[PDB]
Amino acid sequence: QELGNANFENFIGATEGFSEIAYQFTSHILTLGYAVMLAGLLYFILTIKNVDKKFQMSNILSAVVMVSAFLLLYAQAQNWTSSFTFNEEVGRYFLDPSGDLFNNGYRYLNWLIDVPMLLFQILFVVSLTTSKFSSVRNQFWFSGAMMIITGYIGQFYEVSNLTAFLVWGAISSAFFFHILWVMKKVINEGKEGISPAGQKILSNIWILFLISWTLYPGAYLMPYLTGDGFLYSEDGVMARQLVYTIADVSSKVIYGVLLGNLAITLSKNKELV
Amino acid sequence: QELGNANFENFIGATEGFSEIAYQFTSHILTLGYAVMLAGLLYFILTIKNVDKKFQMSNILSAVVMVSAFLLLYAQAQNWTSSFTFNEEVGRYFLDPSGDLFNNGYRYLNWLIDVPMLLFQILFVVSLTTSKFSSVRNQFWFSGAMMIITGYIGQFYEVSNLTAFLVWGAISSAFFFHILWVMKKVINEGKEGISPAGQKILSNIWILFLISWTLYPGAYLMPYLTGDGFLYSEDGVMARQLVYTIADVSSKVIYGVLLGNLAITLSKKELV
Amino acid sequence: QELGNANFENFIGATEGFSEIAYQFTSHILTLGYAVMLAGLLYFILTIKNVDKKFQMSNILSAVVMVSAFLLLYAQAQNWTSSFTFNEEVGRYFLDPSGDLFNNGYRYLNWLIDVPMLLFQILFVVSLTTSKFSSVRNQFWFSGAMMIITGYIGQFYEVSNLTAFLVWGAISSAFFFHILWVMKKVINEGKEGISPAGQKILSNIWILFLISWTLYPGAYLMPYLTGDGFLYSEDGVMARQLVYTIADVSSKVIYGVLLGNLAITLSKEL
Amino acid sequence: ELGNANFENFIGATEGFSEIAYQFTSHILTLGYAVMLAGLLYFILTIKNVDKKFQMSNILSAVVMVSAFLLLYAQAQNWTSSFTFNEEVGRYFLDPSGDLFNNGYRYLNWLIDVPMLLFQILFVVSLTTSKFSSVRNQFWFSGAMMIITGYIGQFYEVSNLTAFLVWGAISSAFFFHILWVMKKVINEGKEGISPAGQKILSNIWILFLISWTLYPGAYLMPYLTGDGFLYSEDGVMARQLVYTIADVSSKVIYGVLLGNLAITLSKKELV
Amino acid sequence: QELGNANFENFIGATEGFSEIAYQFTSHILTLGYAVMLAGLLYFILTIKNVDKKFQMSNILSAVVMVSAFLLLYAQAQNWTSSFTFNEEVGRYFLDPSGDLFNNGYRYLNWLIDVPMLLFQILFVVSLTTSKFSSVRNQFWFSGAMMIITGYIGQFYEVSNLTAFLVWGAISSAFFFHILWVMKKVINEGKEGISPAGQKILSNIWILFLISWTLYPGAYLMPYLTGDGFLYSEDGVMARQLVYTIADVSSKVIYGVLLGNLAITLSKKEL
Ligand code: NA
Ligand code: NA
Ligand code: NA
Ligand code: NA
Ligand code: NA
């Protein structure tokens, strides 16, 4: 019944319920999510000394982000399985009040760790030319926080009030665009003065960044990307968490690995294998 | 509903209940709280060797605080989610007896670890002049203990007895002012004998300490800061936990980072 | 009896139930599973420096795989004990809806981490010759992904739609054969130049790889390997989890140890 | 019908616990295990602050922390599962499904802590006329006997007062022997070291004497005021408060002081 | 009522039930068990560098055994407390279906890690003379696995089929003697060419090994060691888990510590 300002996963769960496939996949993909993060934490810790001292902060901040991501995805995995429970007579999983409603907002507030750190860490690997370290940092952190907070507010209304949903997301999108702007600037300046091999890694980082970060606004909109459409369903629920997981792995783990490799490159006298 | 000497979160949850936003936000913010601490733990451990040996005890102590803060904030997060349970009829979360009442007391007793350590660790980075190490340490430790223990007793009565609440709070404040007094002295003496860049960091630390520590009494009084005011509601519950989380992150993590940076400047190693 | 697209473990659980020996053994073997992985993690971390710097990425990748494996086998172990509950009247464990249906899928998405990593780590130990580092990797990774993803879809139908089960299994099997193809090529190129002890180990790694990886298709089909036969029963359920656990220990822990030993010979003496 | 159970369950089964009694007890158990895990990190991270020959003492502190953390963590959960809130009267009552609460968990775990704590001082100080192995054996035997006898006794703290007292008395005898040996060890360790080192060892002795004596205090607690004030939720709170003060003091502070002594004895200076 | 092929713990628990002391003790001893192992894990990790590089694999293997033993003993502790639940009307803990039946087999399959590793590790400390590393290792691993698997099968029948219980146990014991035979040869060869101090430690390791490992077959038979006798009861239940815990600590931790000490004496380092 009355769900109020809740995520659409609950409305699907309280009305149609989820098939075995939809319920199991979502639980598996979230579990895959946190396993990758913990493993990633290990990777980043064990490779600290593969780069020169001054680049090591980047490994450290990658680890920091792994810790946050693992904790969150682990909790979000337990929340999924607590929120939906098998009805034997129907053969589907339905909303289970005593489990709490499912809410993606857990992710959002944790981005207050992830986003600032991911943006920050590249500043310990590349060299700026025109732009100033503290200034890029502050721009990254202000815009990151605003983006997140406004998106956080909006997602609570994804069902109860489409207008607020779309307005807060548009506002949040403005801050996102600024971030893309500043990061492209940072990538370019970071290319100045370094080896082709290093420039190549930076170019890959920019494509990865652009695509992986754009997946998140995609996950925000997922339920409506097909207009009472195909995605406003358990299919859209699965797709949302799939997109999140692909994005987390890409934006966090792969991103950090590439930065580490750029760092090996820029290090004397170390080279990639 | 007989709740007795319980925090006001339980009275709101037992009467009005919590909206989806109030219950979820409070849970997210408590969850961000403990995630920050475990993340911070890693940071402080992995940066120990960025400062001269004589300063590394500050990093170690920052790490120790992170361990404690993670455990307690993790527990406090679980306390929140099991104390309130969704009612499908009206779509609000209400007090769930079988999960225990919710109490902010976990956090308070955490301070019994953290406060002594956070005040203690700056003494491993700065050098005192006219003050004696042991005498400062002792005043930090005693006044901190009394501040927290008196506040801890007091918060049990925030609803059941407003007079005891305020009187214990008032007493707690007196020890707080003493710690502020002692800390400013430590910071001033620490400025002596070090470079201006170091002095600049200590100034930032003092302002951070001042603002972040004052937030806690703010959180103490939160429900009544608007008088049956606007904050005597789920909004006040949200604001209280938000303020705690900001204060913990500031007084623990940012404080630790600034001390580490100070230790780097003082180290015969530079900043970026 | 409305289970939908669910693993056969649930049908057995919901109809016959499991004997004490069947329920316990399956619980014990899953438990040994995740204990071995955590044990292995510690081993691989502590022996990183036993090889030359350039080989150490393989040790690291082994540790990384152990983390992922421990977490998933631990969860899978809990999935098991949560899904089936003792009935005191007949002395058997039956399906318990409130605990969620049991699904092996946790284990399949684990493979998305482990498979790409395992195939990858060998390239950090041996030298290629005619084919390039990036091309092998990319074929390993693409083929592994497709293998896992098609097998994953297939296992949901292992009872509800036998055809889908077999088709998806076959498609998956194609990418598997492709992987076996590239790998043997990798093993072969890797044998050139190195001492005799090293080629031997590699030959073992290849036998280990071929057997352990073939075990997974066996577990996939287990319940039907005797046709409603002997393995379409709790005995089939025990066998499947026993085979997964042997496979996983072989393909990740034993495989990793050998690669480590190879790296020591190419460095330091055993 | 509770049987040979700790008095906590009798209070919990009849009068119940107030919000403050129940919350405090849970909080103090939680502080306890948090301190232990924090301490584990401290002792590991400071190993290299003393000469190699002293580092075993850090390692043994770490060992004790692992032990104390696990047990206090378990006991914290045991407390909250054993007593459940009753909404009609607003008190927490015994909840059998959670199991009866028992302090005996602590006792068996002292079979790790006690021997390791007594042992570790011998890797920091130097004996003079006494032998390392003899002091070790004395400590270890008396420690085991002290713990086992008390373990047995506490099961009868309500069901059989006489047994409770007799086993406690026997346990105390071994305790007194341990105090005797430790004092001899402290005195010997003072011979030939700097006054800074001697001062610490003196503090270690006072700390050791008070903190260890707190444990028999916790044992007797329900009866320390005779159906008195402490035979109630107040004595339940006090017993756990006392255990936690004792744990932090006997384990952490002790370990920190031994580490400081090791620094003074390292040829490394005390900040 | 209908238990099938289940350990006798479940039969006692379902018929007479467990007293507070029997239930709490068994829980306490299991908790001390996993606590010792995790503490051991730290010790072995933290002492690796106290021996020459060639011997450090023995530490690593000791650590491997600790992780495995902690995990299993922790799981088994939780299974004890969820399999038996308090009945307030009677004052005893009875079988609780929904917690699953209790089974020691968890422990047995865990040995497939510990046994091969414990046997293997001594070969990174001692030097063989006439025997080959590989042959000994293979003999240890094959006989170990067969010992475990045959015993594991046997214990499922400890109540439901005395005949199979003893037959499978007898078979298991055959492989056990073989292991004893091989280990004795390994210890004799390891004594060759080393200082008497080292020889002495090896002699202790042998006695420790002989005794601690033999405790396991004792635990297997425990309920019948006194014939419907004394030990077929909650006392036998207590005794069994006590013996496992003593055995695990001795065979794992103390064994591991002596090997470390042996490694130190052989290291070109002193104890
Ligand atoms: Na569920
Ligand atoms: Na809830
Ligand atoms: Na079960
Ligand atoms: Na409770
Ligand atoms: Na129980």
Coordinates of N, CA and C in Angstrom, one line a residue, chain A residues 23-184:
Chain A
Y23 N 15.1 -11.3 -9.2 CA 15.5 -11.2 -7.8 C 16.9 -11.8 -7.6
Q24 N 17.2 -12.9 -8.2 CA 18.5 -13.5 -8.0 C 19.6 -12.7 -8.8
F25 N 19.3 -12.3 -10.0 CA 20.3 -11.5 -10.7 C 20.7 -10.3 -9.9
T26 N 19.7 -9.5 -9.4 CA 20.0 -8.3 -8.8 C 20.8 -8.5 -7.5
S27 N 20.5 -9.6 -6.8 CA 21.3 -10.0 -5.7 C 22.7 -10.4 -6.1
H28 N 22.9 -11.2 -7.2 CA 24.2 -11.6 -7.6 C 25.0 -10.4 -8.1
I29 N 24.4 -9.5 -8.9 CA 25.2 -8.4 -9.4 C 25.7 -7.5 -8.3
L30 N 24.9 -7.3 -7.3 CA 25.3 -6.4 -6.2 C 26.4 -7.1 -5.4
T31 N 26.3 -8.4 -5.3 CA 27.3 -9.2 -4.6 C 28.7 -9.2 -5.4
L32 N 28.5 -9.4 -6.7 CA 29.7 -9.3 -7.6 C 30.3 -7.9 -7.3
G33 N 29.5 -6.9 -7.2 CA 29.9 -5.5 -7.0 C 30.8 -5.4 -5.8
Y34 N 30.4 -5.9 -4.6 CA 31.3 -5.7 -3.4 C 32.5 -6.6 -3.4
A35 N 32.4 -7.7 -4.1 CA 33.6 -8.6 -4.2 C 34.7 -7.9 -5.0
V36 N 34.3 -7.3 -6.1 CA 35.3 -6.6 -6.9 C 36.0 -5.5 -6.1
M37 N 35.2 -4.8 -5.3 CA 35.8 -3.7 -4.5 C 36.8 -4.1 -3.5
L38 N 36.5 -5.2 -2.8 CA 37.4 -5.7 -1.7 C 38.7 -6.3 -2.4
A39 N 38.5 -7.0 -3.5 CA 39.6 -7.5 -4.2 C 40.5 -6.3 -4.7
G40 N 39.8 -5.3 -5.2 CA 40.4 -4.1 -5.7 C 41.2 -3.4 -4.6
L41 N 40.6 -3.3 -3.4 CA 41.4 -2.7 -2.3 C 42.7 -3.5 -2.1
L42 N 42.7 -4.8 -2.2 CA 43.9 -5.6 -2.0 C 44.9 -5.2 -3.1
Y43 N 44.4 -5.2 -4.3 CA 45.3 -4.9 -5.5 C 46.0 -3.6 -5.3
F44 N 45.2 -2.5 -5.0 CA 45.8 -1.2 -4.8 C 46.8 -1.1 -3.7
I45 N 46.6 -1.9 -2.6 CA 47.5 -1.9 -1.5 C 48.8 -2.6 -1.9
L46 N 48.7 -3.7 -2.6 CA 49.8 -4.5 -2.9 C 50.7 -3.9 -4.0
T47 N 50.2 -2.9 -4.7 CA 51.0 -2.3 -5.8 C 51.4 -0.9 -5.5
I48 N 51.3 -0.5 -4.2 CA 51.7 0.8 -3.8 C 53.1 1.1 -4.3
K49 N 54.0 0.2 -4.0 CA 55.5 0.4 -4.3 C 55.9 0.2 -5.7
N50 N 55.0 0.0 -6.6 CA 55.3 -0.1 -8.0 C 55.5 1.2 -8.7
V51 N 55.2 2.3 -8.0 CA 55.4 3.6 -8.5 C 56.3 4.5 -7.6
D52 N 56.8 5.6 -8.1 CA 57.6 6.4 -7.2 C 56.8 7.0 -6.1
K53 N 57.6 7.4 -5.0 CA 56.9 7.9 -3.8 C 55.8 8.9 -4.0
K54 N 56.1 9.9 -4.9 CA 55.1 11.0 -5.0 C 53.8 10.6 -5.7
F55 N 53.8 9.4 -6.4 CA 52.6 9.0 -7.0 C 51.8 8.1 -6.1
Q56 N 52.3 7.7 -5.0 CA 51.7 6.7 -4.1 C 50.4 7.1 -3.5
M57 N 50.3 8.4 -3.3 CA 49.0 9.0 -2.7 C 47.9 8.5 -3.6
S58 N 48.1 8.4 -4.9 CA 47.0 8.0 -5.8 C 46.5 6.5 -5.5
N59 N 47.5 5.6 -5.3 CA 47.2 4.3 -4.8 C 46.4 4.3 -3.5
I60 N 46.8 5.1 -2.6 CA 46.2 5.2 -1.3 C 44.8 5.7 -1.4
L61 N 44.5 6.7 -2.2 CA 43.2 7.2 -2.4 C 42.3 6.2 -3.2
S62 N 42.9 5.4 -4.0 CA 42.2 4.3 -4.7 C 41.7 3.3 -3.6
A63 N 42.6 3.0 -2.7 CA 42.2 2.1 -1.6 C 41.1 2.6 -0.8
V64 N 41.3 3.9 -0.4 CA 40.2 4.6 0.3 C 38.9 4.4 -0.4
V65 N 38.8 4.6 -1.7 CA 37.6 4.5 -2.4 C 37.1 3.0 -2.4
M66 N 38.0 2.1 -2.5 CA 37.6 0.7 -2.5 C 36.9 0.3 -1.1
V67 N 37.4 0.9 0.0 CA 36.8 0.6 1.3 C 35.4 1.1 1.4
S68 N 35.2 2.4 1.0 CA 33.9 2.9 0.9 C 32.9 2.1 0.0
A69 N 33.4 1.8 -1.2 CA 32.5 1.1 -2.1 C 32.2 -0.3 -1.7
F70 N 33.1 -1.0 -1.1 CA 32.9 -2.3 -0.6 C 31.8 -2.3 0.5
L71 N 32.0 -1.4 1.5 CA 31.1 -1.3 2.6 C 29.7 -1.0 2.1
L72 N 29.6 -0.1 1.2 CA 28.3 0.3 0.7 C 27.6 -0.8 -0.1
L73 N 28.3 -1.3 -1.1 CA 27.7 -2.4 -1.9 C 27.4 -3.6 -1.1
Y74 N 28.2 -3.9 0.0 CA 27.9 -5.0 0.9 C 26.5 -4.7 1.6
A75 N 26.3 -3.5 2.1 CA 25.1 -3.2 2.8 C 23.9 -3.1 1.8
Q76 N 24.2 -2.6 0.6 CA 23.1 -2.5 -0.4 C 22.7 -3.9 -0.9
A77 N 23.6 -4.9 -0.9 CA 23.3 -6.3 -1.2 C 22.4 -6.9 -0.2
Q78 N 22.7 -6.6 1.1 CA 21.9 -7.2 2.2 C 20.5 -6.6 2.2
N79 N 20.5 -5.3 1.9 CA 19.2 -4.6 1.8 C 18.3 -5.1 0.8
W80 N 18.8 -5.4 -0.4 CA 18.0 -6.0 -1.5 C 17.3 -7.3 -1.0
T81 N 18.2 -8.2 -0.5 CA 17.6 -9.5 0.0 C 16.7 -9.4 1.2
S82 N 16.8 -8.4 2.0 CA 15.9 -8.2 3.1 C 14.6 -7.6 2.7
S83 N 14.6 -6.8 1.6 CA 13.5 -6.0 1.3 C 12.4 -6.9 0.5
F84 N 12.9 -8.0 -0.1 CA 12.0 -8.8 -1.0 C 12.0 -10.2 -0.6
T85 N 10.9 -10.8 -0.4 CA 10.8 -12.2 0.2 C 9.8 -13.1 -0.7
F86 N 10.2 -14.3 -0.8 CA 9.5 -15.3 -1.6 C 8.1 -15.6 -1.1
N87 N 7.1 -15.5 -2.0 CA 5.8 -16.0 -1.7 C 5.6 -17.3 -2.4
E88 N 5.4 -18.3 -1.6 CA 5.4 -19.7 -2.1 C 4.3 -20.0 -3.0
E89 N 3.1 -19.4 -2.7 CA 1.9 -19.6 -3.5 C 1.9 -19.0 -4.9
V90 N 2.7 -18.0 -5.1 CA 2.8 -17.3 -6.3 C 4.1 -17.6 -7.1
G91 N 5.2 -17.9 -6.4 CA 6.5 -18.1 -7.0 C 7.2 -16.8 -7.4
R92 N 7.0 -15.8 -6.6 CA 7.7 -14.5 -6.8 C 8.0 -13.9 -5.5
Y93 N 9.0 -13.0 -5.5 CA 9.4 -12.3 -4.4 C 8.7 -11.0 -4.3
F94 N 8.1 -10.7 -3.1 CA 7.3 -9.4 -3.0 C 7.9 -8.6 -1.9
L95 N 7.5 -7.3 -1.9 CA 8.0 -6.4 -0.8 C 7.8 -6.9 0.6
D96 N 8.8 -6.9 1.4 CA 8.7 -7.4 2.8 C 8.9 -6.2 3.7
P97 N 7.9 -5.5 4.2 CA 7.9 -4.4 5.1 C 9.0 -4.4 6.1
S98 N 9.0 -5.5 6.9 CA 9.9 -5.7 8.0 C 11.4 -5.6 7.6
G99 N 11.6 -5.6 6.3 CA 13.0 -5.6 5.7 C 13.4 -4.1 5.4
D100 N 12.5 -3.2 5.5 CA 12.7 -1.8 5.1 C 12.5 -1.7 3.6
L101 N 12.0 -0.6 3.1 CA 12.0 -0.3 1.7 C 13.4 -0.3 1.1
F102 N 13.5 -0.7 -0.2 CA 14.8 -0.6 -0.9 C 15.0 0.9 -1.3
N103 N 16.2 1.4 -1.1 CA 16.5 2.8 -1.5 C 18.0 2.9 -2.0
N104 N 18.1 3.5 -3.2 CA 19.4 3.6 -3.8 C 20.2 4.8 -3.2
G105 N 19.5 5.5 -2.3 CA 20.2 6.7 -1.7 C 21.4 6.3 -0.9
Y106 N 21.5 5.1 -0.4 CA 22.7 4.7 0.3 C 23.9 5.0 -0.6
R107 N 23.8 4.6 -1.9 CA 24.9 4.9 -2.9 C 25.3 6.4 -2.9
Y108 N 24.2 7.2 -3.0 CA 24.4 8.6 -3.3 C 25.3 9.3 -2.2
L109 N 24.9 9.1 -0.9 CA 25.6 9.8 0.2 C 27.1 9.2 0.3
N110 N 27.3 8.0 0.0 CA 28.6 7.4 -0.1 C 29.5 8.1 -1.2
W111 N 28.8 8.6 -2.3 CA 29.5 9.3 -3.3 C 30.2 10.5 -2.8
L112 N 29.8 11.0 -1.6 CA 30.5 12.1 -1.0 C 31.9 11.7 -0.6
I113 N 32.2 10.5 -0.5 CA 33.5 10.0 -0.4 C 34.1 9.7 -1.7
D114 N 33.5 8.9 -2.5 CA 34.0 8.4 -3.8 C 34.4 9.5 -4.7
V115 N 33.4 10.4 -5.1 CA 33.6 11.4 -6.1 C 34.7 12.3 -5.8
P116 N 34.7 12.9 -4.6 CA 35.8 13.8 -4.3 C 37.2 13.2 -4.4
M117 N 37.3 11.9 -4.0 CA 38.5 11.2 -3.9 C 39.0 10.8 -5.3
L118 N 38.1 10.4 -6.2 CA 38.4 9.9 -7.5 C 38.9 11.1 -8.3
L119 N 38.2 12.3 -8.2 CA 38.6 13.5 -8.9 C 40.0 14.0 -8.3
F120 N 40.2 13.9 -7.0 CA 41.3 14.4 -6.4 C 42.6 13.6 -6.8
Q121 N 42.5 12.3 -6.9 CA 43.7 11.4 -7.0 C 44.5 11.7 -8.3
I122 N 43.8 12.0 -9.4 CA 44.5 12.3 -10.6 C 45.5 13.4 -10.4
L123 N 45.2 14.3 -9.5 CA 46.0 15.5 -9.3 C 47.3 15.1 -8.6
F124 N 47.5 13.9 -8.1 CA 48.7 13.4 -7.6 C 49.5 12.6 -8.6
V125 N 49.0 12.5 -9.8 CA 49.7 11.7 -10.9 C 50.1 12.7 -12.0
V126 N 49.2 13.4 -12.6 CA 49.5 14.3 -13.7 C 50.0 15.7 -13.1
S127 N 50.7 16.4 -14.0 CA 51.1 17.7 -13.7 C 50.2 18.7 -14.5
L128 N 49.8 19.7 -13.7 CA 49.0 20.8 -14.3 C 50.0 21.8 -15.0
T129 N 49.4 22.6 -15.9 CA 50.2 23.7 -16.5 C 49.6 25.0 -16.2
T130 N 48.5 25.3 -17.0 CA 47.8 26.5 -16.8 C 47.0 26.5 -15.4
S131 N 46.3 25.4 -15.2 CA 45.4 25.4 -14.0 C 46.1 25.1 -12.7
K132 N 45.5 25.6 -11.6 CA 46.1 25.5 -10.3 C 45.5 24.3 -9.5
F133 N 46.4 23.6 -8.8 CA 46.0 22.4 -8.0 C 44.9 22.6 -7.0
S134 N 45.0 23.6 -6.1 CA 44.0 23.9 -5.2 C 42.7 24.3 -5.8
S135 N 42.8 24.9 -6.9 CA 41.6 25.5 -7.6 C 40.8 24.4 -8.3
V136 N 41.5 23.5 -8.9 CA 40.9 22.3 -9.5 C 40.2 21.5 -8.4
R137 N 41.0 21.3 -7.3 CA 40.5 20.5 -6.2 C 39.2 21.1 -5.7
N138 N 39.2 22.4 -5.4 CA 37.9 23.0 -4.9 C 36.8 23.0 -5.8
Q139 N 37.1 23.2 -7.1 CA 36.0 23.1 -8.1 C 35.5 21.7 -8.2
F140 N 36.4 20.7 -8.1 CA 35.9 19.3 -8.2 C 35.1 19.0 -7.0
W141 N 35.5 19.4 -5.8 CA 34.8 19.0 -4.6 C 33.5 19.8 -4.4
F142 N 33.4 21.1 -4.8 CA 32.2 21.8 -4.6 C 31.1 21.2 -5.6
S143 N 31.5 21.1 -6.9 CA 30.6 20.6 -7.9 C 30.2 19.1 -7.6
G144 N 31.1 18.3 -7.2 CA 30.8 16.9 -6.8 C 29.8 16.8 -5.8
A145 N 29.9 17.6 -4.7 CA 29.0 17.6 -3.6 C 27.6 18.1 -4.0
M146 N 27.6 19.2 -4.8 CA 26.3 19.7 -5.2 C 25.6 18.7 -6.2
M147 N 26.3 18.2 -7.1 CA 25.8 17.2 -8.0 C 25.1 16.0 -7.2
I148 N 25.9 15.5 -6.3 CA 25.4 14.4 -5.5 C 24.2 14.7 -4.7
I149 N 24.3 15.8 -3.9 CA 23.2 16.2 -3.0 C 21.9 16.5 -3.7
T150 N 22.0 17.1 -4.9 CA 20.8 17.5 -5.6 C 20.2 16.2 -6.3
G151 N 21.1 15.3 -6.6 CA 20.6 14.0 -7.2 C 20.0 13.2 -6.1
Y152 N 20.5 13.3 -4.9 CA 20.0 12.5 -3.8 C 18.6 12.9 -3.5
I153 N 18.4 14.2 -3.4 CA 17.0 14.7 -3.2 C 16.1 14.2 -4.3
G154 N 16.5 14.4 -5.5 CA 15.6 14.0 -6.7 C 15.1 12.6 -6.7
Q155 N 16.0 11.7 -6.4 CA 15.7 10.3 -6.6 C 14.6 9.8 -5.6
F156 N 14.4 10.5 -4.5 CA 13.4 10.2 -3.6 C 12.0 10.4 -4.2
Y157 N 11.9 11.2 -5.3 CA 10.7 11.5 -5.9 C 10.5 10.8 -7.3
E158 N 11.3 9.8 -7.6 CA 11.3 9.2 -8.9 C 9.9 8.6 -9.2
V159 N 9.1 8.4 -8.2 CA 7.8 7.8 -8.5 C 6.7 8.8 -8.0
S160 N 6.9 9.4 -6.8 CA 5.9 10.2 -6.2 C 5.8 11.6 -6.8
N161 N 6.7 12.1 -7.6 CA 6.7 13.4 -8.2 C 7.7 13.6 -9.3
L162 N 7.3 13.3 -10.5 CA 8.2 13.3 -11.7 C 8.9 14.6 -11.9
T163 N 8.2 15.7 -11.6 CA 8.6 17.0 -11.9 C 9.9 17.3 -11.0
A164 N 9.8 17.1 -9.7 CA 10.9 17.4 -8.8 C 12.0 16.4 -9.2
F165 N 11.7 15.2 -9.6 CA 12.6 14.2 -10.0 C 13.5 14.8 -11.1
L166 N 12.8 15.3 -12.1 CA 13.5 15.8 -13.4 C 14.2 17.1 -13.1
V167 N 13.6 18.0 -12.3 CA 14.2 19.3 -12.0 C 15.5 19.1 -11.2
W168 N 15.5 18.3 -10.1 CA 16.7 18.1 -9.3 C 17.8 17.4 -10.1
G169 N 17.4 16.6 -11.1 CA 18.3 15.8 -11.9 C 19.0 16.7 -12.9
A170 N 18.2 17.7 -13.4 CA 18.7 18.7 -14.4 C 19.7 19.6 -13.7
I171 N 19.3 20.1 -12.5 CA 20.2 20.9 -11.7 C 21.5 20.1 -11.5
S172 N 21.4 18.9 -11.0 CA 22.5 18.0 -10.7 C 23.4 17.8 -12.0
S173 N 22.7 17.7 -13.1 CA 23.4 17.5 -14.4 C 24.3 18.7 -14.8
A174 N 23.8 19.9 -14.4 CA 24.7 21.1 -14.7 C 26.0 20.9 -14.0
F175 N 26.0 20.5 -12.7 CA 27.2 20.4 -12.0 C 28.1 19.2 -12.6
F176 N 27.4 18.2 -13.0 CA 28.1 17.1 -13.7 C 28.9 17.6 -14.9
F177 N 28.2 18.4 -15.7 CA 28.8 19.0 -16.9 C 30.1 19.8 -16.6
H178 N 30.0 20.6 -15.6 CA 31.1 21.4 -15.1 C 32.3 20.5 -14.8
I179 N 32.0 19.4 -14.1 CA 33.0 18.4 -13.7 C 33.7 17.8 -14.9
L180 N 32.9 17.4 -15.9 CA 33.5 16.9 -17.1 C 34.4 17.9 -17.8
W181 N 34.0 19.2 -17.7 CA 34.7 20.3 -18.3 C 36.1 20.3 -17.7
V182 N 36.1 20.4 -16.3 CA 37.4 20.6 -15.6 C 38.3 19.4 -15.8
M183 N 37.7 18.2 -15.8 CA 38.5 17.0 -15.9 C 39.2 16.9 -17.3
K184 N 38.4 17.3 -18.4 CA 39.0 17.3 -19.7 C 40.2 18.2 -19.7

